[PDB]
């Protein structure tokens, strides 16, 4: 996102506005304002690696922009919007991730390595790779009888078509010691 | 299947191992995934966008 302080009506502020957005959700419901739009109306820009070197970025648009004038004891502990040169803002951090990792629920709550495992195992699992399996003659292939969509989810899943083609089941689970088996 | 289409391979080398490449770089933020990569063998040489 491009932040340019072009607000002669306040501080530094994101070029994209609540209308731009609502103007987009307008087109979502139609299934004319694309991504390309956001890109031509110069509101979002592609910053490679090298260029990334000379810019400043705010994680959350809100969080890291207004002024400072209590804090939730259960919530985590974010640093702060210490800066006024912000020139770009992160669409959403959850996008540092790549497919695999994105299906992991609450990764921001695991010892880093555990995440790197579920990233490789979620590839050994069984699901429904396509809806035309019935007509494909590939060597070997497994389809799970009754796939269910996970109760726990990721906003990023919706794009990975996970709810439409799951790969597991929600099982009533107990965490106890029993027979010993 | 998605995840495979977004896969990257990095030539090995002789002294192969060390760290330098196999490690997660800072510039890696936002372009490559921090968690998804194979265990052992060619760990950190195969990256996922």
């Amino acid at each position: 996102f491009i932040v340019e302080d072009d607000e002669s009506l306040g501080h530094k502020e994101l070029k994209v506005r609540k209308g731009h957005i609502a103007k987009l959700m307008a087109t979502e419901y139609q299934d004319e304002y694309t991504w390309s739009s956001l890109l031509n109306e110069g509101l979002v820009e592609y910053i490679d690696a090298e260029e990334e070197e000379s810019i400043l970025i705010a994680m959350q648009p809100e969080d890291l922009e207004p002024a400072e004038a209590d804090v939730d004891p259960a919530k985590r502990i974010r640093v702060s919007h210490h800066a006024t040169t912000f020139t770009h803002c992160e669409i959403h951090p959850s996008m540092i991730l790549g497919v695999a990792a994105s299906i992991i629920p609450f990764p921001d709550h695991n010892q880093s390595p555990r995440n790197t495992y579920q990233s490789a195992m979620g590839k050994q699992a069984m699901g429904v790779f396509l809806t035309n399996y019935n007509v494909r003659m590939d060597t070997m292939a497994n389809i799970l009888y009754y796939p269910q969509k996970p109760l726990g989810t990721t906003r990023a899943m919706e794009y990975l078509k996970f709810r439409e083609l799951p790969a597991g089941q929600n099982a009533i689970v107990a965490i106890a010691c029993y027979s010993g088996y | 299947t998605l995840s495979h289409l977004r896969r990257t391979n990095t030539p090995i080398g002789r002294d192969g191992k060390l760290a330098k490449p196999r490690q997660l770089h800072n510039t890696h933020w936002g372009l490559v995934c921090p968690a998804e990569t194979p265990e052992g063998q060619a760990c950190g040489l195969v990256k996922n966008l």
């Binding site: 609540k18 959350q60 669409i91 906003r155 794009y159 | 289409l5």
Partner: peptide, 30 residues
């Protein structure tokens, strides 16, 4: 007021529009 700021939940609308166009496999194709 088609010009107010923009909170969290709003980010998605953009992202949603991203993939609406480019798609998970963009790069390979282009």
């Amino acid at each position: 007021d088609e010009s107010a700021p923009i909170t969290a939940e709003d980010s998605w609308a953009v992202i949603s529009a991203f993939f609406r166009e480019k798609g998970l496999v963009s790069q390979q194709l282009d």
